[PDB]
Design a protein around this ligand. Structure first.
Ligand SMILES: NC(=O)c1ccc[n+]([C@@H]2O[C@H](COP(=O)([O-])OP(=O)(O)OC[C@H]3O[C@@H](n4cnc5c(N)ncnc54)[C@H](OP(=O)(O)O)[C@@H]3O)[C@@H](O)[C@H]2O)c1
Ligand SMILES: COc1ccc(-c2nc(N)nc(N)c2OCCCOc2ccccc2CCC(=O)O)cc1
Length: 163
């Protein structure tokens, strides 16, 4: 099982300026609950975007997809392709692809599940933004109710499974 997990604004922005242009603690908790104890696969930009307190992501096997020989920032296992990231895999569990846009595009054809957090923040896309992948007719989804964060932002979760 290969799952994509991401958070996006309603407009479909996932990234800006090498980071994420909102703060939503409830989504961080959701992300940790779904990924704890599992392998997480990310693109190298996302690895370099992690604040030092969160790099590597604790309690997870951190796999970084890069074309470079290796990385200056410690704690990752580097691989040269998504296929190398995904095999061998943890039994009875999902391997989670955790971004960013380039790595989501690589993984989308291989994925069985998507776990999306939608954040109701008004973020018209800007020219260098990373955008969420668009899902096609091979996905069936369900959506949770709108929730209110302690910061006042509304958010909700969507879950998709391959037909
Ligand atoms: N909202 C969310 O859920 C979420 C989640 C994660 C990230 N983000 C955001 O997304 C943005 C980063 O996304 P991004 O698309 O710019 O970068 P990315 O997908 O994180 O990383 C891109 C890098 O991955 C490597 N790569 C890409 N394709 C490859 C291939 N075919 N083979 C081997 N290596 C490959 C390259 O690393 P090298 O250059 O080292 O070769 C490339 O520069 C940031 O703003 C981050 O904060 C948002
Ligand atoms: C607080 O910033 C968050 C940024 C992104 C999400 C997030 N949310 C969903 N739903 N899917 C994702 N792929 C996703 O990005 C995961 C990779 C980036 O992770 C970062 C970045 C900065 C600080 C901390 C962490 C995780 C720390 C940990 O997990 O210990 C969550 C919170």
């Amino acid at each position: 099982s290969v799952g994509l997990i991401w958070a996006q604004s309603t407009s479909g922005v996932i990234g800006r300026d090498g980071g994420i242009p909102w703060r939503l603690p409830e989504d961080l908790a959701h992300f940790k609950r779904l990924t704890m104890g599992h392998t997480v696969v990310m693109g190298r930009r996302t690895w370099d975007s992690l604040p030092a307190a969160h790099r590597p992501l604790p309690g997870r096997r951190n796999v970084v997809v890069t074309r470079q020989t290796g990385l200056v920032a410690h704690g990752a296992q580097v691989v040269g392709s998504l296929e190398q990231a995904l095999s061998p895999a943890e039994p009875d569990a999902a391997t989670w692809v955790i971004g960013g846009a380039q790595i989501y595009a690589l993984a989308l054809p291989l994925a069985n599940r998507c776990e999306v957090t939608e954040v109701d923040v008004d973020l018209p896309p800007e020219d260098e933004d990373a955008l969420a992948p668009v899902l096609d007719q091979t996905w069936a989804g369900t959506s949770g109710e709108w929730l209110v964060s302690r910061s006042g932002l509304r958010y909700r979760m969507h879950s998709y499974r391959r037909l």
